[PDB]
Write a protein that binds this ligand. Structure first.
Ligand code: FF3
Ligand code: ZN
Length: 256
């Protein structure tokens, strides 16, 4: 099935998922000189004080930190969004080397990794109905650069050794995602898609301008994870990013 290798990677996905060549695919290159400041944009509201993490899972492509989304505990509102979007999970994309790993690029610059916090529109009642709607999801993306350590990331780094291979999971309660956010909430926003199969065109992307810093040692532990299952030959989980897709005369709007 799909992956990130030469024989099942991004350039192959369109055969099973034709929407890969669609009109609003993600990620994209953010040309900062062409993005336009949008005064219609309301301020962004990230309300994560009640967030309830439950578990972390290696899904064979990345790891997901899962939240309890059976109530309005952690939500994203405002900015370009109408309504309330509830946090369901976050995950990362990262590279084999510090010069690559992000999915979005900024003036063609690639970061070492990208964090995605995935939220769904509560008006659609559940995640699987929301991904079938053009405004069903809101994903907050945050770039990672290598430099000083991110203290709030270390509890994630700490548990990765217990979910090395595909299908492993570990308990991950009481994790606070507020510890992953940069100081500034300035952002770029555009309509796009999931960046993995099934590549559904349901996402309002909100990409923060300010990256967070993580240490070399932290990202190195990311790179010790495995795409394969236990007892199979080691395939390091690296370069699980989709490259930039054609913008197709969407306009990227800036909040600043
Ligand atoms: N892991 C993944 N979880 N969600 C994924 C997505 F494809 F939906 S993304 N990269 O947020 O568009 S990747
Ligand atoms: Zn993602």
């Amino acid at each position: 099935h799909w992956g990130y290798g030469k024989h099942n990677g991004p350039e192959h996905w369109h055969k099973d998922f034709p929407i890969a060549k669609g009109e609003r695919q993600s990620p994209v290159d953010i040309d900062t000189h062409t993005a336009k400041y949008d005064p219609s944009l309301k301020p962004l509201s990230v309300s994560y004080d009640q967030a309830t993490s439950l578990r972390i899972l290696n899904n064979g492509h990345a790891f997901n930190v899962e939240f309890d989304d059976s109530q309005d505990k952690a939500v994203l509102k405002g900015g370009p969004l109408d309504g309330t979007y509830r946090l369901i999970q976050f995950h990362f994309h990262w590279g084999s080397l510090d010069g690559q790993g992000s999915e979005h690029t900024v003036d063609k610059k690639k970061y070492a990794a990208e964090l995605h916090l995935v939220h769904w529109n509560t008006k659609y009642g559940d995640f699987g109905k929301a991904v079938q709607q053009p405004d069903g999801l809101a994903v907050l993306g945050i770039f990672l650069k290598v430099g000083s350590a991110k203290p709030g990331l270390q509890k994630v780094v700490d548990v990765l050794d217990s979910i090395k291979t595909k299908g492993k999971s570990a308990d991950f309660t009481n994790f606070d995602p507020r510890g992953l956010l940069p100081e500034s909430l300035d952002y770029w926003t555009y309509p796009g898609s999931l960046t993995t199969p099934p590549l559904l065109e349901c996402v309002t992307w909100i990409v923060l301008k300010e990256p967070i810093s993580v240490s070399s040692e932290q990202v190195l532990k990311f790179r010790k994870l495995n795409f394969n299952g236990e007892g199979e030959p080691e395939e390091l989980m690296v370069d699980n990013w989709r490259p930039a897709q054609p913008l197709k005369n969407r306009q990227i709007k800036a909040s600043f």
